[PDB]
Design a protein around this ligand. Structure first.
Ligand SMILES: *[C@@H]1O[C@H](CO)[C@@H](O[C@@H]2O[C@H](CO)[C@@H](O)[C@H](O)[C@H]2NC(C)=O)[C@H](O)[C@H]1NC(C)=O
Lengths: 221, 201, 219
């Protein structure tokens, strides 16, 4: 069938120029007018632009015109993104979609690519535990916290993925210092305290940092 | 019954009319196989206005109209539901509410002769802009100045048509292109044209 | 440019039952030349690229379930569902594509009207190794509480600090059909040493009493 792929996902600092691509393939690819849409962190789909392979673009929606970034090299089935002096708010996820005609529905979409422009440098995460022993009854739950990691969030695993149920990993939370921090918790029985080992494996491939840490509460000397 | 209206007669057939006299063939009482067209890689421009790509084969219409003509490559943009210029305002006006599609592909190997082929023509002058689906074939001579034109050819009063200079050596914007317009008459009337996957099939 | 606006912002419906969304257009755009409606709806699972569900509000798409249908009259367009299901849940949006600009929709969230429940509320004092970092961050979480509304405050020596804390809410999980929140409070090493007892005051619709999970430093 007709499919689309995207690339160019990256961390950048503001005022810098980046190019992304939506490369597509299909039996009939000439039909499919390609449009671009932005999903910011906050809910909302914007439909920033529209173009067609060959011919010309259709008019960009009025608000986005000024940072317009459309297409090139139409023979090779790629729709480049060409813009400069990006705003700090431009960080979001962005999809491409297609339909047959000028006023027709978006049939096929791409994977999407996210980009970040938060102006700070790559930093290695800091991993901390969370343990109860005063209130340690009624199937109390334990987990790990990760703080001061800027570039991009990557998955934690629980004993190399041994346990999966009841685990609730939380989305990244940005702090005033421009970085991120999240927390991953799993519920365990109030008796299975020392019966098992509990280790969070945090991976952060942008920083290439892989850290394993065990968690259990400490009694006083 | 096969009941397939012939795409070849509109595309694979040889003789094409000039743009000022775009050929129209009416289409009814058959089944249209759009899949045969949107899989060929020979077309260089293929645009649509109102139709879906995936449900293209599963639609039913009252009637269809197939227009065919020949224009050069850089006038392909000029056909559109809303557009202006030489060809748009004086030879072929697509309505703003256009229902249908446009196909177009290169015909330099066919409609170009050594030293140029000038058999294809286009109207260059007219006093009022053409109405949608209006084909004017008047040989009346166009008045450009304030002096009353008259007679059978006039000073500053030029013949209303012009040939295309179709040489294989000209720019690709000038290399000839065979163009087909597909209009879809949809009325509260007996729907005679359907696709292979509609509810009647 | 024409404005598309959705009628329901949030929506909580138990499965196997009808749910309806409606969008308003500034100028009705349908059958300007041709019989169909030519506006559509899209659904996008969280963390997923959006897909389409019906062409022109009257044309089901390949691979679309038979219980999905759309009816749109004039400027109003009602999307109805026969039976809500677990895979049906996503953010919902409108499309207008008869004019050259599109504005889409506000966004219609979906829930499950089930397992009206109470949070499993825990508190977590800062880790010891974070004192080397000079920063004092303390966490108070809520596990398996369905009614998404989770008003939480903090109290150090029963002094209210609502400005300092952050909250992180998970999606409604497919497992228990419930949410989970993490409130991450941020402070400093010096200020943390001046106070004694740190707590977490959470009040939920599923709680007949406001509940507090406290701790005293140094135990
Ligand atoms: C005539 O029209 C057909 C319709 O697509 C063109 O395409 C061929 O279609 C036949 C079946 O009808 C297939 O077997 C071939 O594989 C198709 N060939 C190509 C190149 O698409 C066909 O090319 C047209 N021929 C001419 C001379 O115009």
């Amino acid at each position: 069938e007709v499919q689309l792929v995207q690339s160019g996902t990256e961390v950048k600092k503001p005022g810098e120029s980046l190019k992304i691509s939506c490369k597509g393939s299909g039996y009939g690819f000439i039909t499919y007018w390609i449009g671009w849409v932005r999903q910011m962190p906050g809910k909302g789909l914007e439909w920033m632009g529209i173009i067609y392979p060959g011919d010309s673009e259709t008019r960009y929606s009025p608000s986005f015109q000024g940072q317009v970034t459309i297409s090139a090299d139409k023979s090779i089935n790629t729709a480049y993104l060409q813009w400069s002096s990006l705003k700090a708010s431009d960080t979001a996820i962005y999809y491409c979609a297609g339909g047959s005609g000028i006023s027709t529905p978006m049939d096929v979409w791409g994977q999407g690519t996210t980009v970040t422009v938060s102006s700070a440098s790559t930093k290695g995460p800091s991993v901390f535990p969370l343990a109860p022993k005063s209130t340690s009854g009624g199937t109390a739950a334990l987990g790990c916290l990760v703080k001061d990691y800027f570039p991009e969030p990557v998955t934690v695993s629980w004993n190399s993925g041994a346990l999966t149920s009841g685990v609730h990993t939380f989305p990244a939370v940005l702090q005033s210092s421009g970085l991120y921090s999240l927390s991953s918790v799993v519920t365990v029985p109030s008796s299975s305290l020392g019966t098992q080992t509990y280790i969070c494996n945090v991976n952060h491939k942008p920083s290439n940092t892989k850290v394993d840490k065990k968690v259990e509460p400490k009694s006083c000397d | 019954i096969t009941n397939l209206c012939p795409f070849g007669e509109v595309f694979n057939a040889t003789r094409f009319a000039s743009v000022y006299a775009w050929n129209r063939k009416r289409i009814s009482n058959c089944v249209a196989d759009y899949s045969v067209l949107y899989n060929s890689a020979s077309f260089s421009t293929f645009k649509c206005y109102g139709v879906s790509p995936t449900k293209l084969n599963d639609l039913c219409f009252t009637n269809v109209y197939a227009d065919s003509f020949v224009i050069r490559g850089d006038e392909v943009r000029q056909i559109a539901p809303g557009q202006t210029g030489k060809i748009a305002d004086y030879n072929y006006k697509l309505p703003d509410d256009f229902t249908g599609c446009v196909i177009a592909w290169n015909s330099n190997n066919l409609d170009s002769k050594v030293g140029g082929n000038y058999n294809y023509l286009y109207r260059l002058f007219r006093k009022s802009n053409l109405k949608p689906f209006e084909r004017d074939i008047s040989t009346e001579i166009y008045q450009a100045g304030s002096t009353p034109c008259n007679g059978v050819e006039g000073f500053n009063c030029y013949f209303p048509l012009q040939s295309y200079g179709f040489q294989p050596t000209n720019g690709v914007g000038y290399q000839p292109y065979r163009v087909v317009v597909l209009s879809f008459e949809l009325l509260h009337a007996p729907a005679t044209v359907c696709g292979p996957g509609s509810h009647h099939h | 440019d024409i404005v598309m606006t959705q009628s329901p912002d949030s929506l909580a419906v138990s499965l196997g039952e009808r749910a309806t969304i409606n969008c308003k257009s500034s100028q009705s755009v349908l059958y300007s030349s041709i019989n169909k409606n030519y506006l559509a709806w899209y659904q996008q699972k969280p963390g997923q690229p959006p897909k389409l569900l019906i062409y022109w509000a009257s044309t089901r798409e390949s691979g679309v379930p038979d219980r999905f249908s759309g009816s749109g009259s004039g400027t109003d367009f009602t999307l109805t569902i026969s039976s809500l299901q677990a895979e049906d849940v996503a953010v919902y949006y409108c499309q207008q594509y008869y004019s050259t600009p599109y504005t889409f929709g506000q966004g219609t969230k979906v829930e499950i009207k089930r397992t009206v429940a109470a949070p499993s509320v825990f508190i977590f004092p800062p880790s010891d190794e974070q004192l080397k970092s000079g920063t004092a961050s303390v966490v108070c979480l809520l596990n398996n509480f369905y009614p998404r509304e989770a008003k939480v405050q903090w109290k150090v020596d029963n002094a209210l600090q609502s400005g300092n804390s952050q909250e992180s809410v998970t999606e409604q999980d497919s497992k228990d059909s419930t949410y989970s929140l993490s409130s991450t409070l941020t402070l400093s090493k010096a200020d943390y040493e001046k106070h004694k007892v740190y707590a977490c005051e959470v009040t939920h619709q599923g709680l007949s009493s406001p509940v507090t999970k406290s701790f005293n430093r140094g135990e």
